[PDB]
Structure formats: structure tokens, C-alpha cells
Amino acid sequence: TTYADFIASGRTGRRNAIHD
Amino acid sequence: SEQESVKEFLAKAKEDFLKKWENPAQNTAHLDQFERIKTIGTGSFGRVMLVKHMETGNHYAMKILDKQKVVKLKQIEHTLNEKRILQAVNFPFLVKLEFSFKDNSNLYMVMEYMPGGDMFSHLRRIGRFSEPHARFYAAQIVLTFEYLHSLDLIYRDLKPENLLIDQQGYIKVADFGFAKRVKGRTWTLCGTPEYLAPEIILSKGYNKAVDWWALGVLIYEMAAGYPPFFADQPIQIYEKIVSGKVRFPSHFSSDLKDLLRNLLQVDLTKRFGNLKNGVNDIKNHKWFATTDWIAIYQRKVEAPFIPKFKGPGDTSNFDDYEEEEIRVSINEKCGKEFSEF
Ligand SMILES: Cc1cncc2cccc(S(=O)(=O)N3CCCNC[C@@H]3C)c12
Ligand SMILES: Cc1cncc2cccc(S(=O)(=O)N3CCCNC[C@@H]3C)c12
Numbered sequence: 602t603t604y605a606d607f608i609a610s611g612r613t614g615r616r617n618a619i620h621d
Numbered sequence: 622s623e624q625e626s627v628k629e630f631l632a633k634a635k636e637d638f639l640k641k642w643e644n645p646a647q648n649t650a651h652l653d654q655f656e657r658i659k660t661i662g663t664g665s666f667g668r669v670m671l672v673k674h675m676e677t678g679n680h681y682a683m684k685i686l687d688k689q690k691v692v693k694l695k696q697i698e699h700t701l702n703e704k705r706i707l708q709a710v711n712f713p714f715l716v717k718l719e720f721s722f723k724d725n726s727n728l729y730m731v732m733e734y735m736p737g738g739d740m741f742s743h744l745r746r747i748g749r750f751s752e753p754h755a756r757f758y759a760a761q762i763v764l765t766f767e768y769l770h771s772l773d774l775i776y777r778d779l780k781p782e783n784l785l786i787d788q789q790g791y792i793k794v795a796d797f798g799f800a801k802r803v804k805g806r807t808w809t810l811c812g813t814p815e816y817l818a819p820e821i822i823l824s825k826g827y828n829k830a831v832d833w834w835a836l837g838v839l840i841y842e843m844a845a846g847y848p849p850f851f852a853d854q855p856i857q858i859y860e861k862i863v864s865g866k867v868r869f870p871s872h873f874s875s876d877l878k879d880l881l882r883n884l885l886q887v888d889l890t891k892r893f894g895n896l897k898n899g900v901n902d903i904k905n906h907k908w909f910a911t912t913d914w915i916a917i918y919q920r921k922v923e924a925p926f927i928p929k930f931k932g933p934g935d936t937s938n939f940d941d942y943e944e945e946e947i948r949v950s951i952n953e954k955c956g957k958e959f960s961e962f
Contacts, residue, residue, distance in 0.1 A: 603870070604748070607847035611854070615741060615782045616813050617665045618799065619855070621695055 623914075624901070631771045634711070638772050641709035642802070645961070650674075650720035650731060652947070655683065658934060660942040666696065666798065668945070671734060671936055680934045681719060682735070685947060686728040688955040696798075697958050699811075703797045704730060704962055712768045713920065714761045716785065716795040723962050725950045732795070737788060737928030738938030739795075740843075741781035749846035752874060754925040756908065758784070759840050760917045761792050763909075766836065767900045770829045773802050779835035780813050781842065790924025803828075814855040815848045819887050822859045833894030833903070837884030844877060845870050849885065863887075876908040 607613065655672040658680075662669035667686040674681060691700050707718040707730070720731040740758065744750065750758070762779065769776055777799040785795045799811045806826040818834035820827045841849045849868075850861040865887050869878050883902070886892040893902045904914060916922050931937060 603868075604846050607851055610851060612815070612851065613745065616780065616815060618778060618811060618813050620665075621810075 627767075631768070634768065635772060637711060638709050642705070645705055646708045646721070647962070648722050650722050650729075652722070652724060652729065652949070655681070655731070657683075657947070659936050660944055661936055661939040663942055664796075664798075666691070666694070668942075671934060672731065673934065674731075680734040681731045682733070684730040684732070686730075688723075688726060688728060688959055691728070692955050692958060699799060699801075700728065701959070701961060702799075702801050704728075706774060706800045706802060707732075707797045710769070710772070710774075712765060713918065714765045714791065714793055715768075716793040721962070723959060725953045726948065728959060728962055733793075734933075735785040735787055735793060735795070736931070736933065736935050736938060737786040737790075739782055740784040740786060740792060742938070743786065743926070743928075744781050744843065744846070750843045751925070752844060752877060755840055755843035756912060757917075757922065757925055758792055758843060759836065760909070760912050760914070762794070762836055762839065763900065763903055764914065764918060765794055766829075766832050766894075769800075770832070770900075773804055775801050775803060775807065775829050776832050776835075777801065777812055778816075779832065779839055780816050781839070782813075786926075786928055788928070788930060789920060790927040791920055814858045815842075815850060817859070817862060819863045820889065822863055828895075830889055830892055830895040833884055833892060834886075836894075837881050840877075841867075841869075841881055841885070844873060849881075874908070876906075880906050880908040 654674060654676060656675055658671040658673060660668055661671050661682060667684060670683050672681050672683045686700060691697060704721055708721065717733045718730060719733060722729050766776065778796060783794060783796040784792045786792055801807060806828055808826055810821060812821060816835045816838045818827065818831040821831055838849060850858050852858045852861060867885050883893040889895060894900055896902055913922065928938060
């Protein structure tokens with residue numbers, strides 16, 4: 602399921618803004 | 622005549638904003654007036670502490686920015702924008718800046734404390750919100766953006782991480798790091814990768830329409846449990862955003878999907894919020910037919926989720942962070958750069 606793909610992915614924690 | 626009342630509310634709000642925009646509040650407290658309790662959050666710019674104002678006993682969230690790090694990160698102008706804007710605005714779903722000041726080393730922004738936590742933590746735990754639940758939060762952002770955009774403000778960092786839940790279950794937008802007051806186009810690459818409109822990614826020159834794209838991303842994530850464009854690395858997210866394809870979960874209602882197709886619209890001549898009817902293409906969309914816009918503003922709708930109260934200074938809805946101590950140098954740093962702060 603797509604949801605299972607997400608929760609196993611690299612970006613499930615708080616995401617930072619991008620710089621410069 | 623709904624629309625005429627909104628116009629005059631907004632005209633009055635602009636006169637209020639402009640007075641403060643032109644004459645900003647400055648140096649309204651001092652570090653030594655606050656007891657520091659616990660670090661309750663950090664980004665890649667500084668750190669946020671639960672503090673107690675000793676003269677009143679009130680609790681606040683104090684953002685500390687190291688001036689030398691702001692300068693090295695080339696965030697001078699954005700930081701001046703952030704404070705100038707936040708001290709001028711006044712809306713129920715905007716976190717209140719209560720005091721601001723600076724010393725030799727740091728800038729400080731002391732805001733109202735929200736013990737209920739960020740939307741982000743609640744969303745990840747629960748998984749996804751029901752359509753009605755997502756719609757209650759989305760409504761508050763629609764109104765908030767109508768307010769901000771009317772003042773020529775672009776917000777540029779919508780995401781659940783920047784939304785805090787107050788003690789009535791309503792939300793407050795709580796970080797203005799990239800907000801800017803601009804007529805016409807602006808060009809800075811900023812935002813959060815999952816939430817960036819295609820015209821930002823493509824270095825194209827952009828406006829408030831980026832906020833409405835971002836609202837589509839937020840509604841999608843709230844209702845699905847994951848973002849419409851996700852991948853392990855940012856360049857892979859950007860490829861997905863600029864492709865022009867989105868897939869929706871099968872449980873999304875047909876009204877929700879139609880809303881989102883209109884907000885996640887690569888074509889700027891067709892994106893909702895950016896047409897001749899403006900924010901009214903959104904407020905009148907079928908997904909919003911049960912939303913009483915005035916009742917949301919007045920905070921009369923019953924919240925789907927009230928975080929449990931445990932004290933005005935309780936921190937159990939935030940994670941633990943390593944404590945570091947605030948060091949104030951005996952020499953002034955970056956005095957000229959931050960003179961207006
Ligand atoms: C907001 C702002 C506010 N005050 C002074 C400024 C001086 C130079 C540039 C800006 S600025 O617009 O922030 N800026 C620089 C950041 C990246 N984009 C280019 C653009 C010209 C200022
Ligand atoms: C916990 C908290 C609690 N109360 C008020 C707050 C006001 C602004 C920011 C926060 S904060 O969440 O610490 N915070 C900033 C740090 C980076 N993440 C974004 C988020 C809005 C508050």
C-alpha cells in the first residue's frame with residue numbers, strides 16, 4: 602500500500618525548509 | 622452581501638496592519654525577565670524554549686536565533702521580514718508575537734505557548750484525518766491566507782510542522798521565517814520540498830499562488846496520511862511535482878479530488894485562488910459546502926480533536942531535545958545587519 606511505502610521511507614519525520 | 626462584509630473587515634485589517642508595518646514594535650522585553658524551562662523545538666535556524674515571564678507568571682515559546690548563524694546562512698533579510706511581519710499581523714489563526722528583543726549574540730522572539738502540540742505529531746500518530754477533520758483545519762488556513770494575501774503577504778512555508786493546536790482544538794500558523802511582503806513577483810528558492818509549487822522548482826518568478834498549491838498539498842497529506850509527492854530525496858520529489866501527475870487514495874471523496882485537482886494545478890491560469898473570483902473559487906467549492914466560514918472565524922464550530930490539558934507549562938506533547946545554555950558575548954555581533962530588529 603502507498604501508506605506502507607511512506608511510513609517505511611526516509612522522510613516521515615519533521616521536514617526542514619530548503620536553503621540559499 | 623457576505624462578500625461586502627468580508628471586504629470591509631479586510632479594509633479595516635489593512636489599516637491596522639499598515640500602522641504596525643510602518644512603525645514596528647521593538648525592544649519590548651529583556652532575557653532576564655524570563656525563566657527558561659525546557660527546549661520544546663528546533664529547526665535548522667535556531668531553537669525554541671518554554672519560558673515563564675516572571676512578572677506575570679505567563680508561559681511563552683521563545684525562539685532564539687544566533688545572529689552569526691543567521692548571517693552565515695544568508696538569512697538576514699528573511700529574518701527581518703519574519704519579525705516585521707509577525708509583529709504587524711492580527712488574526713485568530715496566527716500565533717501572537719508577544720515580545721521581541723536582541724542582545725550582543727542573539728535575537729529573541731517570544732510568542733504565545735501552545736501546549737497542545739503540532740499538527741504534524743497528531744497526524745503521524747493517528748495516520749490520517751477524516752474528511753470532516755481535515756476540512757475543519759483546511760478552512761482555517763483558507764481564511765488565514767485570504768487575510769495574509771490581502772496585506773500583500775506571501776507565507777511560503779505551509780506544512781503540518783508549522784501548525785500548532787490550541788486549547789480549543791483550533792490551529793495557529795506558527796513560523797514566518799519565509800513570509801514576505803511583495804507586490805508582483807518574487808524569486809527566492811524557499812519552502813519545504815514536498816510542498817513547493819512547480820513554478821518555484823523551475824526558477825520561474827512567482828506569487829501568492831504558491832500558497833494555494835501548498836494548501837492542496839496540506840489537504841492531501843491530512844486526508845491521505847502521506848504527501849502527494851514523496852520520495853527518499855528532494856530531487857526525486859521535484860521530478861514528481863513537475864510531472865503534472867497526482868494519484869489519489871481510493872477513499873478520497875469525488876469532491877475532495879476535484880478540489881485538489883484545482884489546487885494542485887500546474888497551470889497558473891487555472892489554479893484555484895489565482896483566478897478572477899480569487900479565494901471564492903475555494904470557499905464556494907462543493908467540498909466546502911457545509912463549512913460556515915463566519916462560525917470558523919468566530920471559533921463556534923466544535924473541534925474534532927481537543928488535546929488534553931495538563932497544565933499551562935506542561936511539555937508532554939513535544940519531544941525531548943538536548944539542552945545547550947544561552948551564551949551572550951560581551952561584544953555586539955552583527956549590529957548593523959539587525960539594527961531594525
Ligand atoms: C527582503 C529584503 C528586505 N530588506 C532588504 C533587502 C535587501 C536585499 C535583498 C532583499 S530580498 O528581497 O530578500 N532578496 C535577497 C534574497 C534572495 N532573493 C533576492 C532578493 C532581492 C531584501
Ligand atoms: C512548540 C511551540 C509551542 N508553542 C509555541 C510555539 C511557537 C512557535 C514555534 C513553536 S515550535 O513548534 O517550536 N516550532 C518552531 C521550531 C521549528 N518547527 C516549527 C514549529 C512551529 C512553538
